[PDB]
Symmetry: C3
Subunit: 172 residues, 3 copies
Amino acid sequence: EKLKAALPEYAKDIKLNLSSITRSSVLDQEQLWGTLLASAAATRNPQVLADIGAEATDHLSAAARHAALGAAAIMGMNNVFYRGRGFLEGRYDDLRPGLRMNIIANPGIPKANFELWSFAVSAINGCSHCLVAHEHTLRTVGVDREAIFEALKAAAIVSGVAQALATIEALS
Amino acid sequence: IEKLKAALPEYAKDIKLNLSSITRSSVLDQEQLWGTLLASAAATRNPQVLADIGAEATDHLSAAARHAALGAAAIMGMNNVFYRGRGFLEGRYDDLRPGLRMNIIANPGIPKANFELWSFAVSAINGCSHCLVAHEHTLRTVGVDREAIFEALKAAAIVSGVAQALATIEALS
Amino acid sequence: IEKLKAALPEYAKDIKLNLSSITRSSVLDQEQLWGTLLASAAATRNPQVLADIGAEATDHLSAAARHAALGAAAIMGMNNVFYRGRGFLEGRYDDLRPGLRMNIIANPGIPKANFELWSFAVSAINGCSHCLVAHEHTLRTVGVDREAIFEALKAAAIVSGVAQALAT
């Protein structure tokens, strides 16, 4: 509400879209808020992370909250590494990453949910390798594409929100 | 942009030179140029760059222009993520209704040409091939020269270099 | 570091470990390593990471090297947008001259090997295939082993994770 209220007039579709995604009935209240929170972190916009984070506490456990934020952090690294490896046409695929990412195997919350949040973040960062790998995993654990698609929509909407908000604050 | 140029460090002279050059270039309208420097400045998320350019854009852009430019950044902010992502997913989601409102695109409050140019510029900054191509095609359809489009791409890239350059000094001083 | 390593949240434990190790790693020499971490920190746009890494990098980076690293991030901030953009336009704009000044590339004020390594690290962060490839090539051209290049990519990625973790 207060976030929506801070959105400029030249950003009406974003506000509109933020309202519709927040009232989503496709994703769990945990799937939804965990996605919104991981997405918010992935935008790097403090205000957006603060307001989504504040509202998220009344919809997510401390464990869920931490898992959502850690998905953002770990994809921040993976999204750069794998995309780069992919740009090198596989010529370094034999080397050996050597990077820890245990949170992925042991998230502390349902893995279907962690994957959903990781997928959303990979969409924001733009790494096809990770977006595809996570999308495949979601399907393997029973998440339907309607829900996977809703996460893609949410990640995009939240990116718009952060862009819209960043501009108003710097100008006003 | 006079203060921005001054803010740049000697190790970023090329960007300063490029900023000086793109601003004095005449291949683009006074509206196309400042509207592109503005949507680009917005898309880079650097506060100082947006603030400086935004201020210098008022005596160079109409009210409706300044509005359409900032609105292009915001809406591309979402579209550049959505279409890019769906585009990676092997056609598996091409038959689903996005259900995303983007009316500003059909009604920017100014003739479409410039909105599309600024949308194109933003899509370059965010890195979305689907949108870059779509908007480039639309620009052509409504009579915009390649030279103009290419100049926007350059302006988008230079502003991005300026944001990076200034972001680092702000943080280190 | 230390203060940087210590700021990481607990749910970002893996990134803490990765930072601790990439900084203790020898694969890259101290200038290569810290110039890459500095260039990367800049590209993440996170002010705290840039400050901590920039300060720790004073003990291993000459004045010329530090400016080369920061300069690499700035120029790649522009090139990474330009070449990627042109690259998606299906060669339809390849006949036009960019006319963008890039003099720092040929003249970084230090050995190119390092400048190219840092530019490669930034290109990975911004996501421009055209530049990551062009620099990976040059890097191999003048020497530099895949292991060093791979270590920079890892460093760029690890630094991106730190910045995000801190931003959260």
